[PDB]
Amino acid sequence: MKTPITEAIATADNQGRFLSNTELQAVNGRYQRATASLTAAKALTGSAQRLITGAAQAVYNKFPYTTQMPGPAYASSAIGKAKCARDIGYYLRMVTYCLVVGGTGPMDEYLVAGLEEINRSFDLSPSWYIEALQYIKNSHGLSGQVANEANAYIDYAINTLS
Amino acid sequence: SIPILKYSLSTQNQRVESFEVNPGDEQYRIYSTDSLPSSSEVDQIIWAAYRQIFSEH
Amino acid sequence: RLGTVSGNSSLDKLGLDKFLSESNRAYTPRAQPGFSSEYEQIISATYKQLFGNAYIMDSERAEMAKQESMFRDGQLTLKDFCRALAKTEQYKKRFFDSRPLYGAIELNFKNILGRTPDGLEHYRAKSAVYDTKGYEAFVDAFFDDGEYDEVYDDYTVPFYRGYKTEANLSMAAFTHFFRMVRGSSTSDKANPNSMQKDIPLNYYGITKTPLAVIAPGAAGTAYTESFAGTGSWQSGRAGLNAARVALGVPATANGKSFRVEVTGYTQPGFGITAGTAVGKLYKANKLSRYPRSNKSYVVGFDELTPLYQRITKNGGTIASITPL
Amino acid sequence: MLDAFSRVVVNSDAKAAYVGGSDLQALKSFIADGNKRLDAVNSIVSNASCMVSDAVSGMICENPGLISPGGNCYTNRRMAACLRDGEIILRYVSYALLAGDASVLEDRCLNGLKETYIALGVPTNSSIRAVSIMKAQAVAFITNTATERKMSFAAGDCTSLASEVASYFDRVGAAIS
Amino acid sequence: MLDAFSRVVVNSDAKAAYVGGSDLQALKSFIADGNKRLDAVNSIVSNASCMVSDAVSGMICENPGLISPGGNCYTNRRMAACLRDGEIILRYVSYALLAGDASVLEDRCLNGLKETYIALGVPTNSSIRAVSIMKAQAVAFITNTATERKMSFAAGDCTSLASEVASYFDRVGAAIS
Amino acid sequence: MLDAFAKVVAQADARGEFLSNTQIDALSKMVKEGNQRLDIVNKVTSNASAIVTNSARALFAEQPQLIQPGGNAYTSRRMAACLRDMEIVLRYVSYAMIAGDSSVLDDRCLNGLRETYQALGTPGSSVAVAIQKMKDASVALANDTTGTPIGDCSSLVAELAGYFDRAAVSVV
Amino acid sequence: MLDAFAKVVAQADARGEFLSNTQIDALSKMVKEGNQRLDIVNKVTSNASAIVTNSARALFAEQPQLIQPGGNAYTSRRMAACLRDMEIVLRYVSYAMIAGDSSVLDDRCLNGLRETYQALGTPGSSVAVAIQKMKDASVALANDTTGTPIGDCSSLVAELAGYFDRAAVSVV
Amino acid sequence: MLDAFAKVVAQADARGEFLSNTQIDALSKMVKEGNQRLDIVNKVTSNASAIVTNSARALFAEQPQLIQPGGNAYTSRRMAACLRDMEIVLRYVSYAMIAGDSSVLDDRCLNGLRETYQALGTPGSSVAVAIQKMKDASVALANDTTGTPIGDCSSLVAELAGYFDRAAVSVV
Numbered sequence A: 001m002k003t004p005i006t007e008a009i010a011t012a013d014n015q016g017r018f019l020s021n022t023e024l025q026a027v028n029g030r031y032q033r034a035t036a037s038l039t040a041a042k043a044l045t046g047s048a049q050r051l052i053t054g055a056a057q058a059v060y061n062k063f064p065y066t067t068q069m070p071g072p073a074y075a076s077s078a079i080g081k082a083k084c085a086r087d088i089g090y091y092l093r094m095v096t097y098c099l100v101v102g103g104t105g106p107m108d109e110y111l112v113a114g115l116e117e118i119n120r121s122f123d124l125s126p127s128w129y130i131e132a133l134q135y136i137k138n139s140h141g142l143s144g145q146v147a148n149e150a151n152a153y154i155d156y157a158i159n160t161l162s
Numbered sequence B: 001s002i003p004i005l006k007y008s009l010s011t012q013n014q015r016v017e018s019f020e021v022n023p024g025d026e027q028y029r030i031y032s033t034d035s036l037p038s039s040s041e042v043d044q045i046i047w048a049a050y051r052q053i054f055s056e057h
Numbered sequence C: 001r002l003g004t005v006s007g008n009s010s011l012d013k014l015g016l017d018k019f020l021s022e023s024n025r026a027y028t029p030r031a032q033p034g035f036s037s038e039y040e041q042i043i044s045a046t047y048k049q050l051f052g053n054a055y056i057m058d059s060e061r062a063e064m065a066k067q068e069s070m071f072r073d074g075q076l077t078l079k080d081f082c083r084a085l086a087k088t089e090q091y092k093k094r095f096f097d098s099r100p101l102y103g104a105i106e107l108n109f110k111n112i113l114g115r116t117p118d119g120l121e122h123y124r125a126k127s128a129v130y131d132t133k134g135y136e137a138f139v140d141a142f143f144d145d146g147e148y149d150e151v152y153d154d155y156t157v158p159f160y161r162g163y164k165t166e167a168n169l170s171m172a173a174f175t176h177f178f179r180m181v182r183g184s185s186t187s188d189k190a191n192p193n194s195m196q197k198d199i200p201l202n203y204y205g206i207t208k209t210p211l212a213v214i215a216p217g218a219a220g221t222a223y224t225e226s227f228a229g230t231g232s233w234q235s236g237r238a239g240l241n242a243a244r245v246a247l248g249v250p251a252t253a254n255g256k257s258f259r260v261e262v263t264g265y266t267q268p269g270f271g272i273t274a275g276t277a278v279g280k281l282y283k284a285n286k287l288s289r290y291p292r293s294n295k296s297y298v299v300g301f302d303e304l305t306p307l308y309q310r311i312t313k314n315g316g317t318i319a320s321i322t323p324l
Numbered sequence D, E: 001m002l003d004a005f006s007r008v009v010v011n012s013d014a015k016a017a018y019v020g021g022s023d024l025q026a027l028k029s030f031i032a033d034g035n036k037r038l039d040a041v042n043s044i045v046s047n048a049s050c051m052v053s054d055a056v057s058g059m060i061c062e063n064p065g066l067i068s069p070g071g072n073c074y075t076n077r078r079m080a081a082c083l084r085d086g087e088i089i090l091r092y093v094s095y096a097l098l099a100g101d102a103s104v105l106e107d108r109c110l111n112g113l114k115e116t117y118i119a120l121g122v123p124t125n126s127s128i129r130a131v132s133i134m135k136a137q138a139v140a141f142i143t144n145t146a147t148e149r150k151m152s153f154a155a156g157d158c159t160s161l162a163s164e165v166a167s168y169f170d171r172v173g174a175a176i177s
Numbered sequence F, G, H: 001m002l003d004a005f006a007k008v009v010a011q012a013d014a015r016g017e018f019l020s021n022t023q024i025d026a027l028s029k030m031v032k033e034g035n036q037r038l039d040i041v042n043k044v045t046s047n048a049s050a051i052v053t054n055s056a057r058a059l060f061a062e063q064p065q066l067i068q069p070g071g072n073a074y075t076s077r078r079m080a081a082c083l084r085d086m087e088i089v090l091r092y093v094s095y096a097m098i099a100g101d102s103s104v105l106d107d108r109c110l111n112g113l114r115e116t117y118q119a120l121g122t123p124g125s126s127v128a129v130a131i132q133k134m135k136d137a138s139v140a141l142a143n144d145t146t147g148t149p150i151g152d153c154s155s156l157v158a159e160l161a162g163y164f165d166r167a168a169v170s171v172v
């Protein structure tokens, strides 16, 4: 788990160093943006069921074959649609964990590592999840620097699927 | 049973010492398995082994 | 002294000479009056046997000055006499209250029964009595069972028995038994694997895993590796213990694999020139070369030769070598 | 300890199903072949004194360095123990075949006899040469092709059963290995 | 348990040696001046607890901060265990003198005393500083060189056995070196 | 290696739900006391050897068998290696002070450190005294009001005393 | 590794004992079935990703507690490491199909596999029920009469079952 | 490692004083054998192949178990494993004889030899005869003054044979 605090510890531990004024501004700058990032995590938490089901329908409007084609990898059934809504809820949960810790720690560990082994095995396309995340990027309805923190960790997830 | 051909050394940077106590910025990041890493931090060692022995390609 | 076939005897040099010389049985149905050097030898035998060679002084023996006298007519030995010694403050100061519940259970088997319980279904039957019916039936859960009414008839003294095939415990209970018995110069407290504040076999007694049975008093028997489980479900770490399995392509690449057990290194010893490098003697991050000692390795048969060199040119002593 | 009848229950437990007709078809054919296995193990345990005779007097003619003064079967306690150490391990596989499961062999003896034996000092390659000398000693008896004693069975072919006691005794030898 | 009468019979059974009278002359030298061992044992076991009376008192006069806060013989409980700690090992020295081997101090005492004194933090330098004090304290009753006391002896050279206690005192600091 | 923020995240993911509203203001409490925590480790890194040599000279004056000829920490190759262990645990508690938890502290220092002190034959009760000799000196400068505005920093130095107490337990 | 020819070398090897004539006509029976061995390993490894993903899919259907959050196979790191070990047994069983004995399957893959799983905490009864899906998806794959002229392998399909039940009893 | 000059300095530092003058002329007896140690090395380092051929000539004769089919040293690497192990028990004794103690003998060869033979199954019975077949083979080989003058060397014949029996008891 990389945080700003568990990264400046690690460069202090590389040099045998007591925590100098170099490593006391890397952890101070997390505190001047933990205000704006924890309101964005609180806002995305409350509007989760609007954003999950709205993005699951915006996938199905762009890619209509996924609701039509038979076989278990598609959203053409009841349980096929339930597992797609589970997956965007897994994706949106790791965005809010990154706004708590201030970096891409929890989606590196719990989401990204080992993801391409799944998407090739179970025949799931990575462009089904760009369209789900590009909905959430410009339909969360945030503004200012609260939107700047949520839009940083959303397109980190787009770049590890692209 | 045929020892190696006795070559000669030269002048290099690694066979002297640096006098660098508390080294600042260009440290090349000792990834190690005695620091007891987590399962997301074993993964930052395995990438450093692949980058060292292979290239980044 | 070390020896297996040295004088045809395998376990007298393992540390069980006086636990196999004596039998400690009493010969009269009541203790006769007049002579006080024939039955006080039985009491100070049991004061080291039941307490595990712990120091009972006379300042606490006279605190317990009733419970041996009622044995001399009125109690039986081994069934009632050390049962009365197990209900004391001196028994509750060492094996009940400085330590957890399982550590109080798993030291009581060495004290009372002379064995090690295997798995957790033997820990299930003993700890179903403490949480329901107190401490006095917890101690007397042992004394009225088939495990106690068969091995000793009621006028011997309870010995150690956790090494024989008639004591049908397990094969792993052998391997725990020399973690618990380190010669005849230890105790519950003067034991490095657990002091009075700790618990002896937390993982290994539960999961029935066997261990390296090290002969005590050997060269470099000052070793025990610590515990951290690995994996990401249980959120553990990596780098503390070598594995107990040795599977894969490096299983049978170098032949048959082995598990070595190094006692410990220092800073003088790494160079091949018999000294210390005079300088800053460290790196910049100020750790050792082996930054914690008592480490272990997994190695095949075709690299046992340079690894046995590389331990022994560096100051590391070897506990044992077990194949995997 | 596991049974083969118990083996389909924990198969049906984390699956959280009931018992169907599908996995039931293995066990109902196990019933009618039960007497054939019952005609096997009675001759394993009744010629067991010969199988522990040829366990230890056979392995000692192919390495006599243990009866030498200084060996690991020299004294008459270790002579007595090697007669005794082999007559328990075929008693355990007689239990193991009636359940059918090797886990009763594993938890009772085959978890940790290897870690004792290098502290008891005995060699393991001598042991597996004494394990495998009971292996072909066993599989003659189940088929009735033994030379000097021929016993009463019925007529058939228990070579599925005769592989199973050969499927035990290698894991007897691999445990010491 | 070994002694010098039976040290040879665990030596000669590597040879399977029926003992003709060449090697037995050291045992006939052991029965020759074993009275000087016997006249030293009564010069030890009657003067036994005054060896340990100045052992830790001789230790604490030059190593003073073990009765300090953060010591090892601070309390009455911390000190009286140490006086039985030294009197156990000198009881186990003189078992080996009348036996004739180095058996009893290894197969009971130093089959695990190195891990004992590092489980408690017993300082190994001060737990050989007293035993080096108890080295030369234990030679003077054999020598009759003492400033304070004379034992009724016969006058010969026991210097073969006056350093044999020091040749037991070396391998008590084998593991706790 | 976890943080205080990453410990409450990792408990949420193993339950499989978002962070509650009671957990965000529990962390919004933790960020407004950040400049108190930055002022604590600025006090015990600006005196990061004046703590240590004054804790060594306190202990060596108290316990004299360390410096005795024949001692454990007698010679000058076992004196800097005594001052190495006194300086890395002041380093690694200060890493655990800035993290908010101590899972950096036990895995990078204290996992089996009393087992390596068992192998060297080191008296471990006196090094636990030396951590306690360092513990009160660390809170005497954390409570020092010079140069900072005055407020209440009560439970933060009881957290800092708990990190030294966790270090001093598992070294004996 | 050992195959069937390497058996009777080391089974006579340890007496010097040469090769007797009554054994090798059973071994020249095995080369009559040498062409019915290599089709059959080609039947397994051509479908080597359709036996894995069709049986992990039928594993999580009946056991939803492994893919639920807080389960063993929950995250994408531990889903990929569940499909890794489901294919590892498919390699070392088919290695034992081509060789003639078990002794590369239970020496490189099954020697401590359940005690790997007791240390990690995976349900060792549940890996056996995924393997027994792969047993039924491969024995019923290796009885097709397309691609080969129909031949009775009935003797050679019991050997393919007999290593799939050897991994079914290794992991519990 | 430490040597015979080092232990009377190891008891001059761990005791803690200066030198006694009885500790100085005890080292005169070390150079009363000091030239007489040096030609004793010539009776064992010039006959390195000569002892280890003449001993293993004898050792399989009265003990024919090692050359049996199913014996220990059967393959030629195992028979070469005997010759690399017969000499090092004499090589580190030859390191111990120039040293004057057994510190480097215990450091690099002996500690880790009883259990290493027991894990491999090579017997502790017959690795002591490889001490004993070279024990009498160097009592004769070093007791002759061919090149050096004649006097008393009745000490050091009870020191190199004071090291073989140390290796004999440290392996059985």
Ligand SMILES: *CC[C@H]1/C(=C/c2[nH]c(/C=C3N=C(/C=C4\NC(=O)C(CC)=C4C)C(C)=C\3CCC(=O)O)c(CCC(=O)O)c2C)NC(=O)[C@@H]1C
Pocket: B010, B011, B012, B013, B015, B016, B017, B018
């Ligand atoms: C009064 C000295 C003059 C001077 C010296 C100077 N030298 C260097 C740097 C290096 N010198 C070497 C040479 C060797 N290194 C070795 O290990 C060996 C043994 C094989 C040799 C022969 C090397 C490799 C360096 C560079 C690495 C290093 O820093 O050690 C420097 C440092 C230059 C800098 O700015 O860092 C100095 C100052 N220079 C003068 O001005 C004096 C006249």
Ligand SMILES: *CC[C@H]1/C(=C/c2[nH]c(/C=C3N=C(/C=C4\NC(=O)C(CC)=C4C)C(C)=C\3CCC(=O)O)c(CCC(=O)O)c2C)NC(=O)[C@@H]1C
Pocket: C265, C266, C267, C286, C287, C288, C290, C291, C292, C293, F066, F072, F073, F077, F078, F079, F081, F082, F083, F084, F085, F086, F088, F108, F109, F110, F113, F116, F120, F122, F123, F126, F127, F130
């Ligand atoms: C004043 C302190 C007490 C004391 C300390 C002491 N320690 C050692 C030696 C070691 N300690 C360790 C353990 C670690 N070293 C590390 O770098 C780390 C971080 C990863 C740990 C957990 C190790 C490995 C050694 C040996 C190597 C080394 O020198 O660092 C010593 C030296 C003992 C010796 O025999 O060399 C001392 C003196 N001892 C005391 O008396 C004080 C109470």
Ligand SMILES: *CC[C@H]1/C(=C/c2[nH]c(/C=C3N=C(/C=C4\NC(=O)C(CC)=C4C)C(C)=C\3CCC(=O)O)c(CCC(=O)O)c2C)NC(=O)[C@@H]1C
Pocket: C301, C304, C305, C308, C309, C312, H066, H072, H073, H078, H079, H081, H082, H083, H085, H086, H088, H108, H109, H110, H113, H116, H120, H122, H123, H126, H127, H130
């Ligand atoms: C013929 C003598 C007896 C004998 C010898 C034998 N030894 C081995 C194997 C090993 N011996 C060692 C020990 C050391 N190796 C070293 O390099 C050193 C010095 C640093 C020592 C003390 C080791 C590590 C091995 C294993 C690796 C190797 O083969 O070298 C073997 C082989 C065992 C096998 O079964 O293959 C033999 C046969 N064994 C006897 O029976 C003779 C009495």
Ligand SMILES: *C[C@@H](*)[C@H]1/C(=C/c2[nH]c(/C=C3N=C(/C=C4\NC(=O)C(CC)=C4C)C(C)=C\3CCC(=O)O)c(CCC(=O)O)c2C)NC(=O)[C@@H]1C
Pocket: B039, C231, C232, C233, C247, C248, C249, G066, G072, G073, G077, G078, G079, G081, G082, G083, G085, G086, G088, G108, G109, G113, G116, G120, G122, G123, G126, G127, G130
């Ligand atoms: C259907 C999946 C089941 C499951 C799988 C699972 N396994 C692990 C972890 C390991 N498995 C092994 C075993 C092997 N690894 C190998 O490389 C080989 C062949 C050489 C074998 C036999 C090992 C060593 C591990 C730990 C290392 C690893 O692979 O990660 C895990 C945990 C993954 C983690 O990172 O913690 C899972 C989830 N478990 C289940 O619940 C399913 C039933």
Ligand SMILES: *[C@@H](C)[C@H]1/C(=C/C2=NC(=C\c3[nH]c(C[C@H]4NC(=O)C(C=C)=C4C)c(C)c3CCC(=O)O)/C(CCC(=O)O)=C2C)NC(=O)[C@@H]1C
Pocket: D047, D049, D050, D051, D053, D054, D057, D058, D059, D060, D061, D062, D132, D133, D136, D137, D140, D141, D145, D146, D147, D148, D149, D150
């Ligand atoms: C009790 C006698 C049984 C019995 C047992 C069987 N033994 C079989 C083979 C066999 N027997 C020995 C022992 C004997 N022969 C020797 O050469 C030596 C000395 C080294 C001894 C003590 C050996 C070695 C073997 C071979 C096994 C091996 O080493 O692989 C055997 C199988 C042959 C057969 O009968 O078909 C059996 C059944 N025989 C009986 O019927 C009684 C009841």
Ligand SMILES: *[C@@H](C)[C@H]1/C(=C/C2=NC(=C\c3[nH]c(C[C@H]4NC(=O)C(C=C)=C4C)c(C)c3CCC(=O)O)/C(CCC(=O)O)=C2C)NC(=O)[C@@H]1C
Pocket: E047, E050, E051, E053, E054, E055, E057, E058, E060, E061, E062, E132, E133, E134, E136, E137, E138, E140, E141, E145, E146, E147, E148, E149
């Ligand atoms: C009791 C009085 C015994 C007795 C015991 C003997 N003690 C002997 C030697 C000895 N004692 C000490 C400790 C003493 N010296 C000190 O400097 C201090 C205090 C700081 C004390 C308490 C030492 C150091 C030694 C010498 C040991 C050594 O050399 O390391 C001894 C040997 C000869 C002698 O001194 O008499 C004996 C016999 N003496 C007795 O006879 C009664 C019965």
Ligand SMILES: *[C@@H](C)[C@H]1/C(=C/C2=NC(=C\c3[nH]c(C[C@H]4NC(=O)C(C=C)=C4C)c(C)c3CCC(=O)O)/C(CCC(=O)O)=C2C)NC(=O)[C@@H]1C
Pocket: A024, A025, A028, F034, F035, F036, F037, F038, F039, F040, F042, F142, F143, F144, F145, F146, F148, F149, F150, F151, F152, F153, F156
């Ligand atoms: C309790 C441990 C202390 C104490 C702490 C307080 N410091 C307060 C404010 C403050 N501190 C700093 C310096 C610090 N902040 C940083 O970001 C960095 C490094 C980059 C350092 C060294 C600053 C700049 C400030 C003002 C703005 C801010 O809070 O960050 C403070 C608040 C004052 C108040 O209570 O009104 C407290 C309590 N004060 C004490 O007296 C004890 C010794």
Ligand SMILES: *[C@H](C)[C@H]1/C(=C/C2=NC(=C\c3[nH]c(C[C@H]4NC(=O)C(C=C)=C4C)c(C)c3CCC(=O)O)/C(CCC(=O)O)=C2C)NC(=O)[C@@H]1C
Pocket: C053, C054, C055, C056, C184, C185, C186, C187, C189, C190, E056, E066, E072, E073, E077, E078, E081, E082, E083, E085, E086, E088, E089, E108, E109, E113, E116, E120, E122, E123, E126, E127, E130
């Ligand atoms: C005094 C000369 C030393 C010293 C002594 C201490 N010994 C302590 C405890 C202790 N010692 C033994 C071993 C002893 N008992 C035996 O049965 C045998 C062999 C037959 C021997 C050598 C044991 C078993 C124990 C623990 C007993 C118990 O406490 O129940 C000890 C610690 C007592 C405590 O922790 O309060 C000390 C201080 N230490 C020294 O520093 C001087 C030099």
Ligand SMILES: *[C@H](C)[C@H]1/C(=C/C2=NC(=C\c3[nH]c(C[C@H]4NC(=O)C(C=C)=C4C)c(C)c3CCC(=O)O)/C(CCC(=O)O)=C2C)NC(=O)[C@@H]1C
Pocket: C009, C010, C011, C163, C164, C165, C166, C174, D055, D056, D072, D073, D077, D078, D079, D081, D082, D083, D084, D085, D086, D088, D089, D108, D109, D120, D122, D123, D126, D127, D130
């Ligand atoms: C003969 C084929 C072997 C062999 C036999 C020896 N076993 C010896 C001792 C021994 N064995 C066990 C395990 C035993 N208990 C059981 O419950 C089972 C079965 C599950 C077995 C095999 C134990 C616990 C002991 C020690 C007994 C004790 O200490 O009381 C032994 C030596 C006896 C001794 O050392 O006194 C021998 C000779 N060893 C061999 O060399 C061949 C291969």
Ligand SMILES: *[C@H](C)[C@H]1/C(=C/c2[nH]c(/C=C3N=C(/C=C4\NC(=O)C(CC)=C4C)C(C)=C\3CCC(=O)O)c(CCC(=O)O)c2C)NC(=O)[C@@H]1C
Pocket: A059, A066, A067, A072, A073, A074, A075, A076, A079, A080, A081, A083, A084, A085, A087, A088, A090, A091, A110, A111, A118, A122, A124, A128, A129, A132, G057, G060, G067, G074, G075, G076, G079
């Ligand atoms: C939804 C947008 C589209 C879609 C989804 C779909 N997904 C699956 C199955 C799986 N998805 C995963 C993915 C993850 N698991 C994780 O733990 C994480 C990190 C938190 C991720 C990203 C996995 C492991 C599976 C398989 C197991 C399961 O049943 O969930 C399916 C089912 C496939 C099947 O074969 O049953 C579906 C249908 N597919 C669509 O059609 C949508 C466009």
Ligand SMILES: C=CC1=C(C)[C@@H](Cc2[nH]c(/C=C3N=C(/C=C4\NC(=O)[C@H](C)[C@H]4CC)C(C)=C\3CCC(=O)O)c(CCC(=O)O)c2C)NC1=O
Pocket: D032, D033, D035, D036, D037, D038, D039, D040, D042, D142, D143, D144, D153, D154, D155, D156, D157, D158, D159, D161
């Ligand atoms: C009271 C004690 C007691 C027993 C001893 C067994 C006795 C027993 N054996 C078999 C019966 C049998 N047993 C065998 C077994 C064999 N035949 C061979 O050719 C091989 C040598 C050997 C093992 C492979 C066979 C082939 C049958 C006949 C098939 C059957 O009906 O089971 C049967 C069923 C038929 C019958 O009634 O005879 C019974 C009851 N059961 C008992 O209750």
Ligand SMILES: C=CC1=C(C)[C@@H](Cc2[nH]c(/C=C3N=C(/C=C4\NC(=O)[C@H](C)[C@H]4CC)C(C)=C\3CCC(=O)O)c(CCC(=O)O)c2C)NC1=O
Pocket: E032, E033, E034, E035, E036, E038, E039, E040, E042, E142, E143, E144, E153, E154, E155, E156, E157, E158, E159
């Ligand atoms: C049950 C108790 C009991 C005993 C202990 C022995 C007592 C005993 N000690 C010695 C005898 C002796 N003791 C010594 C010893 C010494 N003289 C010195 O001045 C030295 C300081 C010291 C040497 C260390 C010597 C030299 C002899 C005479 C030689 C001999 O041992 O026979 C003798 C032989 C003298 C004789 O024949 O009368 C006897 C019987 N016997 C017993 O019945």
Ligand SMILES: C=CC1=C(C)[C@@H](Cc2[nH]c(/C=C3N=C(/C=C4\NC(=O)[C@H](C)[C@H]4CC)C(C)=C\3CCC(=O)O)c(CCC(=O)O)c2C)NC1=O
Pocket: G035, G036, G037, G038, G039, G040, G041, G042, G142, G143, G144, G145, G148, G149, G150, G151, G152, G153
């Ligand atoms: C490099 C890969 C490779 C292979 C896999 C085999 C494939 C193979 N099989 C057969 C030939 C055959 N193969 C089968 C096999 C089968 N029929 C069944 O019902 C089972 C499903 C299946 C066994 C697994 C049969 C029954 C024959 C014809 C009989 C015969 O071989 O004589 C032939 C024709 C030559 C011959 O008859 O031997 C070939 C080339 N050979 C190879 O070179």
Ligand SMILES: C=CC1=C(C)[C@@H](Cc2[nH]c(/C=C3N=C(/C=C4\NC(=O)[C@H](C)[C@H]4CC)C(C)=C\3CCC(=O)O)c(CCC(=O)O)c2C)NC1=O
Pocket: H034, H035, H036, H038, H039, H040, H042, H043, H142, H143, H144, H145, H148, H149, H150, H151, H152, H153
């Ligand atoms: C520089 C390297 C070097 C050597 C190679 C040896 C060789 C050697 N030894 C001796 C000298 C000696 N060498 C011996 C040795 C022996 N006599 C015996 O009866 C034994 C059988 C045999 C041991 C194997 C003795 C006893 C002396 C002293 C002569 C004497 O006693 O008068 C001398 C004469 C100088 C001296 O006395 O030191 C030399 C050069 N010594 C060395 O310093």
